Design a binder for this molecule. Structure first.
Ligand SMILES: [Mg+2]
Ligand SMILES: [Mg+2]
Lengths: 90, 255, 34, 267
């Protein structure tokens, strides 16, 4: 249920950065969809992202650190696999 | 010397066939590496079927071992890649088989002109049934230098420039087709008198150095030593011109 | 792909470089055969 | 259709190149003699020049001919010239280095109209006629679409006949090696020009070239999108023999880079 964006722009003191980070999070939740944190009400991913923003648990830093954690896990797993293959080829 | 050479020749045949086939998809930086990987992979299959014991050494895959670590396969599926990137047809496949800390089998195959140079240590290096008798020049008079600009070793840029300047003051002319392996094959077959390049790599010259030495020539580094295997600094040709070149090029080096 | 736009005169060599040929006849399309 | 004089020229060049290939596989039949600096000239030059002259006179018994050997054979007419090099890179054919070509171009009122170069070893046939373009064995030629001096390949020649510029030349090359990726050196001006027009090398330049060593390639690189000039941006390159050629961007960048390194004698 989104009718305004004032709470969101309060959590991010600029409408421009607001829509930017919210579109980034919505793209996350739409393609390669991370599960939406706030329980959706059968709504589009856009308002889901806005709600997750205004609730106070999504912002620029949170998105960046989540991306970095994903990078770390991904690199650790794939490097373990490549070392296993390296032993398998010898 | 017969079976190893036959296997290597068939491998170079398949590599050149695939390369020339893929040479007909015109496009105007990545797919060149893709067909490179593909030729390397079919080479790898040739290595696995025939003699699965030997070990492979490629610029791409590093070194992939089996059980017989005493037989290293140094296979560059492409030399002078930029040429094939620009459709300029001067490129070849370079197969080498080193045994007991020493190169023994060498093959360089250009699929465009169908140039298939083979080399076994001792009995020498043939081409299509012909023996490469090196160059006839005794000095740097009127000779040609298979010169190579270090487009990967820009640190020695100015030094190399001063060196080639002294040379062209003394020598006659250069050549550079942008293919180290084929440059070595050509200086081996007397097509160009002398050769010298900076910052090369074992998978590049692994076969060409033997092709040269079997042709009444020598291969060395810029200081007459034998560490050119890894220092990447190579000068080659029949001994007369190599001596005449070193005597002029020593006194402006940095290594 | 870019961050600027340059504009200036075109040397005759430049113009002849752009072209893929030289038009010589005025008539455009034959009507008995389009 | 196909330009008439272009057809005659390409037939003649085909015959000359077949004779060249014939002389190639016999490292015995070549009986050369030194004429200049660090280069011979062979009997094969004379044979090919004779074949070309005869084939031309067959269908053109009055056109003027130009050649390094016969100088200028002034036919009864003097507006249609045929600049001929039966061999570019005779040094390479001496050492049997399989990289050379025959070159034939036609000047009308001083303007090059048709031009061909022929590499018999790879059976490559660079044709080019004015106002219609350049073709490689049936494919169009647009030259390298590179837009700057980065990653480019630069074909060049060392002045084995005028080695005085060498030092200067060296500096030039040195300066260029600061930006460009790699150079190319085949000892064959015509094939360098062709490769430029072929988009195989992204730029060429040479100090002190002979008039009949580019008059065929220059039309190729012209009608293949590229441009040619001297080292100062002028059109006097036909006299100075100082050539730069390639797509407009790389030529402009090379000229801007070389404006300083060059010497006043060349400008
Ligand atoms: Mg390689
Ligand atoms: Mg000539």
């Amino acid at each position: 249920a989104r009718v305004t964006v004032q709470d969101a722009v309060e959590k991010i003191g600029n409408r421009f950065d607001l829509v930017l980070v919210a579109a980034r999070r919505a793209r996350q939740m739409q393609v390669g969809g991370k599960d939406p944190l706030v329980p959706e009400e059968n709504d589009k991913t856009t308002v889901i992202a806005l709600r997750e923003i205004e609730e106070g648990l999504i912002n620029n830093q949170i998105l960046d650190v989540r991306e970095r954690q994903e990078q770390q896990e991904q690199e650790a797993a794939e490097l373990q696999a490549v070392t296993a293959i390296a032993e398998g080829r010898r | 010397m017969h079976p190893m050479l036959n296997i290597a020749v068939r491998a170079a045949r398949k590599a050149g066939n695939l390369i020339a086939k893929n040479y007909e998809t015109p496009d105007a930086n990545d797919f060149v590496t893709n067909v490179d990987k593909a030729a390397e992979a079919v080479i790898i299959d040739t290595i696995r079927k025939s003699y699965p014991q030997h070990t492979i050494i490629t610029e791409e895959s590093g070194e992939l071992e089996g059980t017989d670590q005493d037989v290293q396969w140094v296979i560059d599926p492409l030399d002078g890649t930029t040429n094939f990137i620009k459709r300029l047809p001067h490129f070849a496949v370079s197969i080498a088989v080193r045994i007991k800390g020493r190169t023994e089998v060498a093959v360089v195959y250009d699929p465009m002109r169908n140039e298939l140079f083979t080399a076994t240590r001792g009995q020498g290096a043939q081409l299509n049934g012909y023996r490469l008798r090196g160059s006839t020049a005794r000095d740097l008079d009127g000779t040609i230098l298979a010169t190579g600009f270090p487009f990967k070793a820009k640190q020695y840029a100015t030094t190399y420039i001063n060196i080639v300047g002294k040379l062209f003051n003394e020598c006659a002319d250069f050549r550079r087709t942008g293919s180290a392996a084929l440059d070595l094959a050509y200086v081996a077959a007397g097509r160009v008198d002398g050769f010298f390049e900076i910052g090369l790599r074992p998978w590049d010259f692994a076969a060409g150095e033997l092709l040269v030495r079997e042709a009444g020539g020598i291969v060395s580094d810029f200081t007459g030593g034998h560490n050119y295997m890894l220092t990447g600094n190579i000068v080659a040709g029949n001994p007369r011109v190599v001596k005449a070149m070193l005597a002029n090029m020593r006194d402006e080096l940095s290594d | 792909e870019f961050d600027a736009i340059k504009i200036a005169l075109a040397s005759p060599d430049m113009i002849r470089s752009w072209s893929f040929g030289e038009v010589k006849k005025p008539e455009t399309i034959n009507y008995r055969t389009f």
